[PDB]
C-alpha cells in the first residue's frame, strides 16, 4: 500500500505531532481545529488547538490547551473533541474515561478559541459514550450529538441508562444511532435528556444492526446546507464516512451515501466546515506514521454539495487507488 502515500489528495496539516478526529470551526474570523493528540494504543492525554488564519494559510499549532491531569473527573483517554462558542466564551467538549472505566463527556471553558481552557470538575450529566459534536444551529440553539459503539460503549446504553447486559443489537434489530440533546444556554449542561437519532434507509426503514456498510458506528457531525441538516458519521468496520439528511436537527435522517472512502489506518473520523467561499472536509489517516492505526494526522479536502443536495464521495488517495480496506 505504499502507493497510497504517493497519490494522497491531501498532505498532513501538521507533522510535528500526531493528530486525529479533527473538529473544524470558524471562530473570530479564522479556522480553528480541535483534534485529538496521538502520543507515541489510544492513550491520548491532552488537546492542542490549531489555526488557519485564512483559505490556503500555513497551519499554526497554538499549543496544548487542556490535559487530563486538570480534569478531576477523568483518568485517561482524551478522545475526539469539539468546540462551541456562546456569550463570548469558547467551550471545549471532550470525551474521557473515568477511573471506573466509563466514558463520559465533559466540557472546559475559555475566554478565547485558543484557550487556556478550564475544565469543569464533573462531566456533563446525562452524557456517556464518546465523540461529541456541537451544532450551532442557524436559529441560535446549540445541540450536542454524541456516541460510539465498540470501545465507545454506546451499546451499553438504552434510553440514557447503562446496564452491563445491554449489548450491541444484531440482525434485523435497528442499529443504534447517535444521541442528541439541546444544550442549555449555559452550555455546560444539557437542556433535556438525550434522544435517539434515527437513521432511515431509502424506504423509510431504520437501518439494521447487521448493515455495517451504513449503520452508525461513531463520530457524528452535523452541518446545515440548503435548508436541511446533514448528519455524517463513521461506519467503523466498513471504514466509511457516510451521511444522511433531515429537515430537523433531531432527525430522523435518511441515509444518502458515502462521503469519504476508506483511509489508511483502521479509524476514520471527520468534520465538515464552511470557510469563506468553500466547504471543507477535515479527516485523518495514518500515512504519516507509516500506516499505524494509533498514530494519525489530520487532513483537509474541499467538499462540494451537488444541485440535488447530494455530496459526491471523496477518495482520499484518488478514485483509482487500491482501497486500504
Ligand atoms: Ca468528532
Numbering used by the authors: 10 to 49, 60 to 344
Show me the paper's own sentences about this structure.
To understand the catalytic route for the exo-oligoxylanase activity in the GH43 family, the native enzyme and the complex with product (xylose) were crystallized. The structure of the free enzyme shows a glycerol molecule occupying the −1 subsite. The crystal structure shows the presence of a Ca2+ ion near the −1 subsite. The Ca2+ ion is coordinated by the His288 Nε2 atom and by six water molecules in a pentagonal bipyramidal coordination geometry. The water molecules coordinating the calcium ion are connected to the carbonyl groups of residues Ser32, Asp150, Pro151, Ala99, Pro100, Asp30, His289, Gly238, and Pro239. The catalytic triad, inferred from structural comparisons with other members of subfamily GH43_115,17, is not interacting with the calcium ion directly. In particular, residues Asp150 (pKa modulator) and Asp30 (general base) are part of the second coordination sphere of the calcium ion and might interact with His288, while Glu237 (the general acid) is far from the Ca2+ ion. All structures show that the active site is clearly blocked at the negative subsites, having only the highly conserved −1 subsite, which supports the exo mode of action, with the recognition of the non-reducing ends of the substrate.
